[PDB]
Scaffold this active site. Sequence first.
Site, PDB file in Angstrom:
ATOM      1  N   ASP A   1      79.479  21.744  29.710  1.00  0.00           N
ATOM      2  CA  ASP A   1      80.517  22.649  29.251  1.00  0.00           C
ATOM      3  C   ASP A   1      81.466  22.354  28.354  1.00  0.00           C
ATOM      4  OD1 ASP A   1      79.779  23.977  31.613  1.00  0.00           O
ATOM      5  OD2 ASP A   1      81.694  24.063  32.544  1.00  0.00           O
TER       6      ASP A   1
ATOM      7  N   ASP B   1      82.988  27.022  25.002  1.00  0.00           N
ATOM      8  CA  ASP B   1      82.597  26.174  25.849  1.00  0.00           C
ATOM      9  C   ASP B   1      81.349  25.941  25.298  1.00  0.00           C
ATOM     10  OD1 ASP B   1      84.933  26.513  27.441  1.00  0.00           O
ATOM     11  OD2 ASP B   1      83.594  26.642  29.474  1.00  0.00           O
TER      12      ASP B   1
ATOM     13  N   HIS C   1      78.953  30.954  29.904  1.00  0.00           N
ATOM     14  CA  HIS C   1      78.092  30.172  29.905  1.00  0.00           C
ATOM     15  C   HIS C   1      76.768  30.803  30.018  1.00  0.00           C
ATOM     16  CE1 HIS C   1      81.024  27.092  31.687  1.00  0.00           C
ATOM     17  NE2 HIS C   1      81.252  27.133  30.371  1.00  0.00           N
TER      18      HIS C   1
ATOM     19  N   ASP D   1      73.272  29.121  30.187  1.00  0.00           N
ATOM     20  CA  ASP D   1      72.251  28.468  30.845  1.00  0.00           C
ATOM     21  C   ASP D   1      71.691  29.080  32.362  1.00  0.00           C
ATOM     22  OD1 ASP D   1      74.578  27.503  31.418  1.00  0.00           O
ATOM     23  OD2 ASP D   1      74.009  25.409  31.385  1.00  0.00           O
TER      24      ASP D   1
ATOM     25  N   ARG E   1      70.531  39.892  34.634  1.00  0.00           N
ATOM     26  CA  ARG E   1      71.252  39.916  33.144  1.00  0.00           C
ATOM     27  C   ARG E   1      70.093  40.151  32.132  1.00  0.00           C
ATOM     28  NH1 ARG E   1      74.005  34.631  35.325  1.00  0.00           N
ATOM     29  NH2 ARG E   1      75.402  35.714  36.965  1.00  0.00           N
TER      30      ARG E   1
ATOM     31  N   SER F   1      80.841  29.881  40.575  1.00  0.00           N
ATOM     32  CA  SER F   1      79.455  30.462  39.944  1.00  0.00           C
ATOM     33  C   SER F   1      78.952  31.612  40.759  1.00  0.00           C
ATOM     34  CB  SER F   1      78.683  29.625  39.418  1.00  0.00           C
ATOM     35  OG  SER F   1      78.062  28.862  40.635  1.00  0.00           O
ATOM     36  N   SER F   2      77.969  32.120  40.261  1.00  0.00           N
ATOM     37  CA  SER F   2      77.060  33.162  40.955  1.00  0.00           C
ATOM     38  C   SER F   2      76.045  32.354  41.624  1.00  0.00           C
ATOM     39  CB  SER F   2      76.400  34.099  40.048  1.00  0.00           C
ATOM     40  OG  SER F   2      75.130  33.504  39.461  1.00  0.00           O
TER      41      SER F   2
ATOM     42  N   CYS G   1      73.894  22.082  33.850  1.00  0.00           N
ATOM     43  CA  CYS G   1      75.260  22.153  33.887  1.00  0.00           C
ATOM     44  C   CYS G   1      76.179  20.822  34.021  1.00  0.00           C
ATOM     45  CB  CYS G   1      76.018  22.982  34.823  1.00  0.00           C
ATOM     46  SG  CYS G   1      75.872  24.945  34.460  1.00  0.00           S
TER      47      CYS G   1
END
EC number: 2.1.4.1
Lengths: 360, 360
Positions: A107, A191, A240, A242, A259, A291-292, A344
């Site tokens: 990050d 970031d 982000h 990644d 996405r 996050s997801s 991450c």
Amino acid sequence: CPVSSYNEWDPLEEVIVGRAENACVPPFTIEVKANTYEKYWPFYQKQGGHYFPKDHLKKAVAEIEEMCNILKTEGVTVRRPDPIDWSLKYKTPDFESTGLYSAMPRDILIVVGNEIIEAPMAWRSRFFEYRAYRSIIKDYFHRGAKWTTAPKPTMADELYNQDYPIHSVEDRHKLAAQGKFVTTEFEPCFDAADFIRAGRDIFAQRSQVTNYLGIEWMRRHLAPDYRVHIISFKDPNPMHIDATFNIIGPGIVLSNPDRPCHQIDLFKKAGWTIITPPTPIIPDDHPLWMSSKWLSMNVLMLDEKRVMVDANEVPIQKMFEKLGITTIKVNIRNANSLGGGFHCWTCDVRRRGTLQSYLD
Amino acid sequence: CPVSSYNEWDPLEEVIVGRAENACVPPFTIEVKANTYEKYWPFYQKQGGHYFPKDHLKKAVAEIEEMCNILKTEGVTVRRPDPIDWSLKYKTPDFESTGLYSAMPRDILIVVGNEIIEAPMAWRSRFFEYRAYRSIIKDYFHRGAKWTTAPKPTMADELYNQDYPIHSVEDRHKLAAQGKFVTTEFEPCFDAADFIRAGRDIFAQRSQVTNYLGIEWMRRHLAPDYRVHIISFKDPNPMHIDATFNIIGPGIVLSNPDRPCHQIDLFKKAGWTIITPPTPIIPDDHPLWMSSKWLSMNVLMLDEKRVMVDANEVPIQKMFEKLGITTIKVNIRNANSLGGGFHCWTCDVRRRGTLQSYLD
């Protein structure tokens, strides 16, 4: 020359792995809310300023220690940031806040060639996150690496769209369609994780925490050797790249099915192989505070044929296996709650290889 | 219920602090030599049976009086052992000797719950050290505390490896690797300081003065409520664990970089945070008659966030400060010569808290 890395796949030799220690729930300000799923707002509202659940942090600590043992087994040199209490309240002339953590090196640090760049960040609770990595960076600097810190923002109110429709509305997509997010273009901010490397070509995404000013700063700072391209995807809450477009080899990329990339044709025309991973199997009852569920494709490549993948995500393991990629399974289910997967939780400092072009 | 303490960090309320008065150089017998650095052998050879340098004791007395004022300021009730002349020569049917001191309460007393246990000891000059603490212990006993004295050894020749290669050889490491030291397994013996508490789990180290018989006596005496685990480190002259593996909070431990733990993985898997302190800055010309320079990590926790640390050891002070732990600096440079830091100079009698498990 400890530092040297031009992409995400060359033979890994040195890496920095984050820490879950003393992680604190960030205060619930506009930029945090823009990233938080409705499901966790009460948690943030009550927990802000306090540590993330300690019994939960303990499991993450253990998981990451194991991940480090595996990296060492695979011959990778591992460095860790310094232990810091993120609950300290600090005050700049523009705002006051408590910190977050130093769990995600991706990050804040990005390595381009022989240079380590500290991203400016865009969250108030992450203003002083660089402090955890200074011991490591000075050592690399004393040993010859180039060191750069992009302009630290003031993070004054003007940087945030105080009236962003975070409160759910989904037309986030519409503003998002206009490159319009919770962060304004008041000053550069970003970031490092919104950038993903591929030799001479780096791809960036304008997201909730990375504005066009920030991207232009990178583009201008790295030119003429590196070309920074901006790409976008169908995503109402980007933060982000990644776990959306993870490049795993020369000309091979994992594209999150949820996405899609608006500029996918640029890659198809380039003869790149676009692989769409299967869906994550992570339970919906497991807390993912930051996050997801897509952390499953947030893989880290030890090299072209070796990938560190989540032990629990069998479907995606099978996928790599059918492609001839050896899977090194590690369980980080609890560390996932802090917001990141393997990519991450790390920052590749040195990969054995040269600067090349893969976009022709 | 004056007595009540299950670990090293809960809010301290009552403590016993040692005394430097009338301390005597122990006669130079095999077990003393096994602990003494080559540098001081002539001192022990000439001074044995006489008082430690009085001008030096005077400085220690002053330092400890101040330390006591600070403890009282921090709201801790302080008790002190009785003043005794340690030069008296005593004689048991097995041996004759002069005493040492009552400077280190941690060496002889350990509190587990509501019970105070007097360790048996393993040094002939410390056979009658308990006499200094009887007034305090009887008072606690009259007030409800459980009182236990582990089996006092005969300390006959059979307890000592009269042919131990103390004379320098370093293969001490090899015997040490075999759990083989200057004390045999002839009868139970141990110093309480080789045990460090963490609620339901107590960790012990087989050392020059604590044998397996002694550890088994503790394990058997405390079961089933407490589990006593044996751990080892890379150390050729072990005597006490608190300057090697000092537990400072629930799941946080200071591990001496020079003395790595063979079972560190047990703790890593438990999600414990292992912190390695910076090196001591104490001058090599300052006499440390009974220990190593590592007294710097021999800190005493007033609570989770307050630590009593040496005023002169700035590097380690900074470390605690970056972790959010308030440092209460006290100078005990001269008291250090007698062999201990803050943890050794005290014995926590009462800490506000409950019995818990931190190893999961």
